[PDB]
Amino acid sequence: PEQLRRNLARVVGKPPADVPDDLIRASLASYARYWREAFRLPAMDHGRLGEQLDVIDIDHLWSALDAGRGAVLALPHSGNWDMAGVWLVQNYGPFTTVAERLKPESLYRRFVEYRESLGFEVLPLTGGERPPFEVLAERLTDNRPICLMAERDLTRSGVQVDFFGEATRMPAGPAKLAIETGAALFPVHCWFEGDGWGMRVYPELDTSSGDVTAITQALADRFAANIATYPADWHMLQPQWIADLSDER
């Protein structure tokens, strides 16, 4: 919860102690809401959710699937993204994504089971039959959408970028897959709109440069703009910015 305060401190541009108490309370309540919904989500009426929830500017994705290009949906850890996946399963169908292999293994199996119970194909970042990036590229060349949580990747293979004025690292997956397959790279945002769920697809990024850093940086700029719009719904309690970290890669 302390690191959450330090991150909203970066999001709003104030020292940690000056972050509004109402924002901290709303962020903790939203994070709790995410877990409260993740508990009961496999048991809810997914047909109802798919029929009653809407996605702003969803047609960008449709048009990219009408063009046969595929689509990479990159969104930050905001709102409830498992509900957005449920929505996509009901209004389009199963899509493929990757999940970090957590420890213990029983826990990773639990998360795989959980997301599979929503209708997703989950590819193991390690220990799978094939390299995940190449299965994703195959999904993209078949004109199908993949969804990647693309605002945090603090490993040696992360793309260093500016994020609210400070240095972070974000995954390279979306840009490498949009380049290699020509798929439209759409920034996506989910948030909590009252007792409902708000979701939005934004215009696809310009991949003309072929520069993975420039593309991931424009993706970061869009994520930061959306988080700044819905600051209470971005439940990033892990260290996000480099300075709150120690040691090398």
CA distances from 73 to 19, 28, 169, 238 (A): 31, 26, 18, 22
Q: Which residues are catalytic?
A: 77, 151
Tell whether residue 51 is among the known ligand binding residues.
no
Pick the closest to residue 50 from 94, 79, 87 (CA basis).
Answer: 87
Measure the CA angle with vertex 48, ends 37 and 51; round to 5°. Answer: 115
- Categorise residue 68: left if φ over 0, alpha if ψ from -120 to 50, beta otherwise: left
Q: Which structure tokens are listed for 217?
A: 């940086």
Tell whether residue 115 is among the known ligand binding residues.
yes
Phi, psi for 182 (deg, rounded to 5) = 75, 5
Tell whether residue 157 is among the known ligand binding residues.
yes
The binding site comprises 77, 115, 157, 180
The binding site for hexadecanoyl-CoA comprises 77, 115, 157, 180
